[PDB]
Amino acid sequence: QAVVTQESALTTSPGETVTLTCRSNIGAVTSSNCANWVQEKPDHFFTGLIGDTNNRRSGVPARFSGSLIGDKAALTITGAQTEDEAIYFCALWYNNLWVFGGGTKLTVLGQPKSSPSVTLFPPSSEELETNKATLVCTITDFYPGVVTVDWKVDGTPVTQGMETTQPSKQSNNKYMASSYLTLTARAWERHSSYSCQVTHEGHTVEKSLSR
Amino acid sequence: PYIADCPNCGHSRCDSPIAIEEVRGDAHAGVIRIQTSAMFGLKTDGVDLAYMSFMNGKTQKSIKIDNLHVRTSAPCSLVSHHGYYILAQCPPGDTVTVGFHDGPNRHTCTVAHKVEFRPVGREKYRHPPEHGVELPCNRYTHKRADQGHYVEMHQPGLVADHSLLSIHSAKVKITVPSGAQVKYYCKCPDVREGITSSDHTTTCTDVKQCRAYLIDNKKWVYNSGRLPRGEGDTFKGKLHVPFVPVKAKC
Amino acid sequence: QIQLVQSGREVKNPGETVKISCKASGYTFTEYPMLWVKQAPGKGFRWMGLIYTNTGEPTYAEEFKGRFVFSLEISASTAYLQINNLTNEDTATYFCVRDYFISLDYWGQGTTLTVSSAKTTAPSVYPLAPVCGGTTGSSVTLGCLVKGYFPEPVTLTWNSGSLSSGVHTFPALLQSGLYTLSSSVTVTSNTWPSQTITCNVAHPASSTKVDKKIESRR
């Protein structure tokens, strides 16, 4: 019966100072709200940063500090780093329960771009023994995390049969994704040239197999 | 530096550290000896009478005296401070009105007290002249090296501080200044004394039904009427008065 | 130091019950109670309640009083979430969390539940070896395709988990009523096919375990 509000997204560059805020719909935030700040890195990875407004969890870099600014709780990153790019959630206590904010997606300049590593595999034979054939195109270590995957059977853009996952964040903070093109044992044996084309930060990478 | 309840603290009854008790317009020399509940003088530790320590929070603030103002019907003139106590040359005034300037805020304190200054003599002036005869007036000293009397100054009682009683995300959460003694329970049944570090509260939830207390008797106080008793004991702390009334010839 | 490791992700058809464990490490269980938080797919983070790991009394958020029940295997430093009469809109991830320092200091890994009607289909595990010709670089990428299973989850390791560096496991995705997952691994060209590289797959719901060694196409 209280609504915590946070900035939606904030973009900064390595070395800058950035402030995230946490607003309560009922009134000014005070020390009896024990503002907590939590960080979510990709992979459902949670860590606590600050608690009780300004107590930094142990092993959280000092570039992170909490405080009350005006009528709201604030988190300041002093010397933001590339590693700080994540979702920050604030939590406020209200005498009997906790209310979490919507979280702020923070983007920090860094991590020089990285091209994808693409590999296309042929349907294995144990699978061709099922009267099925699935060409797997794996794409890993790319950043920025956005790609376009296009399949081309025998020179012709396939347009049905393919499925491409959504970019998932790896540990190093780069992304990955795979695309599947399912044919029939038979569709397989028919056509002759398969190719998985991946477009990333303007360059294209085509990986073709030959049956 | 004690903090008490000023009666007409700018708006109305605040709790100023410079809460004025024991106004003494009883001498002749245009002078009043006053006690603030604030202990200006040296700092917290060791230096320079002309600095300024009042209470902000549970905490002191031992900094410069920059812009003191005692005043009455007119602005007074400071004479000297020592301890809780200031001497200042004032004119007559129906009231007494005191205040410094921390710098962000005026933060004054004011009080009623019937003041007059008859000079000693068959002349009923309103003010001391530059000339005339000298004769035995009653008056307070400039100085501090003074023992002619001493007032009892034993401990403080507790004080409220609801900045302590935060929330442990569902429960009301007390903390401690520095390991000080926080005397705690709530209307519900939970921990009943409180002599602790930072506790939580299993039972109650609301901040407004709990005992935010500070038994912090590492430094005694003046025994103001606007003090709550330290219920335990009459601790020691017999402490002098600087500004003795002396037989100056005004 | 402090590790809260949670159970793996379940699939359950509407109406069922689930018991999600949270095994605590590094602290004395008893002086720090447990927060249960629901991060729903879109919606963001929500406090589900707190359990006094000392007395055992739970607090539920009002949204959670009813089908939700917190309990603890005190003795083993485990806290557990049980959601009975599962509703389809309970698919989400649930985190256990330690309440300390006037907030929450450590969060678990999460246990994701996918409430969904469906039978039980064992996966087909297929080796992904490089193209029949050449493939000459300083390194080499092999793969493993885990196709057509239900429900979640499956676990996948490489060489019983001794080969974890250079691995990309790709989140399972639903296609035609079945889940499909895949993984790649990259090693130096001297390692493979000199040394054996094996994909290990388990599908608990069907009691299926498959070990598939990646063999050269010729």
Author numbering:
A (entry chain D): 501 to 711
B (entry chain B): 501 to 750
C (entry chain C): 1 to 218
From the reporting publication:
Here, we report a 4.4-Å cryoelectron microscopy (cryo-EM) structure of eastern equine encephalitis virus (EEEV), an alphavirus that causes fatal encephalitis in humans. The icosahedral shell of alphaviruses consists of an outer layer of trans-membrane envelope E1 and E2 proteins and an inner capsid layer separated by a host-derived membrane. Alphaviruses utilize the E2 protein for attachment to incompletely characterized receptors (Schwartz and Albert, 2010, Zhang et al., 2018). Endosome acidification triggers conformational changes in the E1 and E2 proteins that generate the fusogenic conformation of the E1 protein (Gibbons et al., 2004, Haag et al., 2002).
The binding footprints of Fab fragments of five neutralizing mAbs (EEEV-3, EEEV-5, EEEV-42, EEEV-58, and EEEV-69) were mapped using cryo-EM structures. In comparison, Fab fragments of EEEV-3 and EEEV-69 interacted exclusively with residues in domain B. Monovalent Fabs can achieve neutralization of alphavirus infections by either interfering with receptor binding to domain A or by clamping domain B in its neutral-pH conformation, which inhibits subsequent pH-triggered conformational changes. In the EEEV-Fab cryo-EM maps, the sumf values showed no significant stabilization of either domain A or B upon Fab binding. In contrast to domain A Fabs, a tangential binding orientation of a domain B Fab will result in clashes with Fabs bound to neighboring spikes and also with E1-E2 dimers from neighboring spikes, thereby lowering the average Fab occupancy. This will result in incomplete inhibition of pH-triggered conformational changes of domain B. In contrast, mAbs whose Fabs bind to domain B may favor interspike cross-linking as domain B is located at the tip of the E1-E2 dimer.
